[PDB]
Amino acid sequence: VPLDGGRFATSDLNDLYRRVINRNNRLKRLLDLAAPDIIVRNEKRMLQEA
Amino acid sequence: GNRRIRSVGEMAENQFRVGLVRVERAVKERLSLGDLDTLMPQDMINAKPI
Amino acid sequence: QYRYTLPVKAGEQRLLGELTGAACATLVAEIAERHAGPVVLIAPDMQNALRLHDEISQFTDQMVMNLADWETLPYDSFSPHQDIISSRLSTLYQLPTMQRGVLIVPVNTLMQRVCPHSFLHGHALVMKKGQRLSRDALRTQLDSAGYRHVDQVMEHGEYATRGALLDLFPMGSELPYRLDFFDDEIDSLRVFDVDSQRTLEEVEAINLLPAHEFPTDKAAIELFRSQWRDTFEVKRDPEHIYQQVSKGTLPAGIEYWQPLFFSEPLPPLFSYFPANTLLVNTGDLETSAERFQADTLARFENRGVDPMRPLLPPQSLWLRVDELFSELKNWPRVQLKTEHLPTKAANANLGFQKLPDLAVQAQQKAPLDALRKFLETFDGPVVFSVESEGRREALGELLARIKIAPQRIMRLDEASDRGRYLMIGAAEHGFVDTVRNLALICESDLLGERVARRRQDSRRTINPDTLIRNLAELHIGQPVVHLEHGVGRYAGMTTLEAGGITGEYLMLTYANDAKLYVPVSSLHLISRYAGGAEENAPLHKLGGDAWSRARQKAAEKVRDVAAELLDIYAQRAAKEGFAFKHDREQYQLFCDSFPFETTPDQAQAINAVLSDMCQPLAMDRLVCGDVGFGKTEVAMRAAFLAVDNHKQVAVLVPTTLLAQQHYDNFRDRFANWPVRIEMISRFRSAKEQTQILAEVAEGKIDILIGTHKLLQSDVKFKDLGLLIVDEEHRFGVRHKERIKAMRANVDILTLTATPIPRTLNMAMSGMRDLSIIATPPARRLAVKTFVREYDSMVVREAILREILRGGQVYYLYNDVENIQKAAERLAELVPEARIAIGHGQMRERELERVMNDFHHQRFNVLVCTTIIETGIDIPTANTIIIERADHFGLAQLHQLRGRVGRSHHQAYAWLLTPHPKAMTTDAQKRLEAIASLEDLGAGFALATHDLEIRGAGELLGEEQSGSMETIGFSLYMELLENAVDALKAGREPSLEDLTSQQTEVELRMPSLLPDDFIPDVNTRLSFYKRIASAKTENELEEIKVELIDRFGLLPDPARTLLDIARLRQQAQKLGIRKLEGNEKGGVIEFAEKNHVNPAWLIGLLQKQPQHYRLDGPTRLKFIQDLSERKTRIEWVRQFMRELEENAI
């Protein structure tokens, strides 16, 4: 919902969905580019914590 | 004889003393900061925490 | 003949004196060259030791080593970095028998005790082929180690000895080795099989070094536990050291629990000295040993607490001082010291007079007066002792100014009666040896003054009659000048208390009735008024603090970015990139010039670079990775491929220093190919700039390096084919794409350390490529990192841990106004450190002095701003202390963590924090991110932490970091392709050349089409096309009324835009090429074939010289108070209306 002052609601579940889909898309691209593995290890760590 | 009244002035004293402790730590770091020779006792202390 | 005999006795001392700087090094070189036997120099401290460690090799040729000391503090909580231990024991292996050689140990090490030699001669083996030893000798040494003779060896603890061939199967390795002794010597190192008995490898020197200095196995563990239960008391704790080692694992400082891992008394390393060894002394021991022992004890009862990790008494882990001075009567000893002992036997003072005042300055007219007046009157030979090779040429033309010829010799004995020679070495100070009249002069013997300059103090020279000569009969209300502040009204004398001292003072009233009470003692600062205006005198306000002057109200958006970024992006996506050509063997011969081997990830990064370079597409590749991972040679292989296709490689870096290293790297790597490589910065002269940039158009320089000077709207590459940009997270957006504005389909390759969020997001969203690198070639260190609260003793022990290692400390404060105070605040906190000051705002000569003196270890701790972020060398610096890590960008946090390290030494990094609830939440997220990731390869994911806490910036604007509620990327791509096919719809000229052919009409006034008037950036773009392509005022007005038709009224930015276009029409009509205007006036620059009425322009000049000056032939500076921009527009309008009325 807009807060009547030009911005939106807080709505933390959309924030968490945005965060998780960011990590997921970033990791998908990272596996697409065939990075060396130690990068995608801690990215999978980050997505799991997300 | 084990419980005492602290009235209006004593609590205002305590709140004022808490504010004084915050501003004296601030002005203490400001005084330990150099360039004292051009300093004044007005920019060194700030009326916001009191 | 030499000068002095030596101590050869059981305990004799040999006193030597008259010793100035760096003479002791060539003296002990003499000692080593004259004594058939070892030389062990005892050092007073690490620093001098390390300093002497490159001194002595300058003067002689023998193999010279330190003993690797444990790097830690006494009773510290840190492992000594096993590799160092591996170096430590190794030297300690050959220390019992080493015939010739020089070992420098410090009193920190020499007071330390070592392993009991049972473990070393039993549980370790280094053996080289040039070791003349027999068969049964090694047989009985294996027997004494406890090994078993099996003639078909398979088991740990076995060896074979048949005929001449000996075999061994150790505790350490799973393989036996064949020895083949001949003529009382070792003659094979044959790695043969456990069963098949044929050789795997022919070795010269076998290195079976134990994994620790101490026994580690089970029997050692129960022996240790027996010792601990005898000494300390065991508590039920899963972190207590007894249970911790009982689990088999190890804590950090475990080695400081030394003697429990042997159950023997520990030797003081004197046991490891050879038979007739010669100890040489430096400074004294009789001082430093005392205060080291005092520090040792003070630290011991400082941590003689804490049943979690209790400590042994220092009597086992060290000698006592008296114990040292007893064992120092067991060896013939030399004491070198810096004064004149009078006379006795076993004593000599050798003429080593310090150098006279030889110094250079720019203040005198001929700078080398002292040297030019010294050298003709110095009867002996003269030696020049330059450190570096290229710095040799820094002396080469310098003494050529005094016309004096250096010859390169190697040996100090090479001196003649009178001759001038250069010596390449590592000295620091010179001297005259008056025995042979020899003179050694260091480079640092030239620049003795690291001096600043004073100022102010004007009225202290005004001792005139107005000072009143301290009359003390002054009246009240007298306006009185007090020279530091100004004039007040004197209001009497007053007594005040001052902290247990009552006093009498002169109360003086300044402005806003602020009192000031100078003492009656210092009455001479006080002067009577001189202006004669005693009843008209002003009043100064005290303090002069006008900071309030930082309030508000600056506007922005003078120039739109979004349309132009969309334009350059559409132009790139419209045209096609260059398909490069690759030669196998020509590229392979370039690969041969690389004197290394590519790590496999580095290779495939290089392969992805070339297999994108050679394509019809345009390269746009991030080559992100951690610093020091080998990024540059990727760009080398890229450029070579580019440059052989004749494509004029352009290199961009954001500082002069990085350009300076890059010039060396490029020139040294391209040392065999017909390519000319140069650089440009502010350090280049204009006369060099004016030929380099001109020649760029001609183009025999193919590789050009520089700062922002390339992006200065004058550099014209004749055929640009490769952009390489380094150290990305700078450069805004405009500087980044300002080069691509020149050539739409240029290939761009961007190196970085940690990419900025915008270029990270745009790369990860498929717009640009990404190629990550990891796995550094040399095994570098993850320099342990901490984030702790500010604590005066924590920073103290950090400083101490670094300085008794011997290196230097970067201590960064990043506020120049108080760094002077913070210097002494640190300095009496650590009184034995040496602190100098360095920041970016000094006078640009003392800074270089500070950094070079730092580079020559003349002081230990440097207080600094973030000037060090420019990435200087000197890896001896090994500890960063960021005092207020609250306000520092996370990318350059990683960068500063990259500053320490660069060594096999374990670097450290303390990140001081304020109190956790005081700081910003974002700062806490930053510090949790930096405390999470301490590895190699973690730079990139740390940039993924930089993103997603600040928001990756807007995809079609500036401001690389920020949430900003941008253009959505799917909508971004749609607008992009719409621009693409609308662009290639009918071959529409790129907007950038509509910039170039346009006359310069800059007026410092906001002239654009605002986003509210036109939301669609394609439409605003094509309107920009139509206005700058419009060539008639009729078409300008038609476009204007069409805009009005489409969107209502015409706002002021649109109106100003359109009339500037009108002005451009008559500017190009007359020949008025360069028009700049401002508030103050501006410059009208005409063409060479201009429509200026010359006589009428002279009439303008002679009717108003204040508003018309020809400064140049066609440069007319007009000075007008153009306060209103409407008046500015009408002024310039009516002015060119006058000029067209006078057009010819």
Ligand SMILES: Nc1ncnc2c1ncn2[C@@H]1O[C@H](COP(=O)(O)OP(=O)(O)O)[C@@H](O)[C@H]1O
């Ligand atoms: N494949 C390799 N094998 C051995 N050493 C390498 C290799 N690649 C790089 N190095 C070493 O690492 C350094 C490379 O650093 P460079 O790419 O010049 O800049 P950065 O320090 O930013 O990586 C060089 O000093 C080089 O000696």
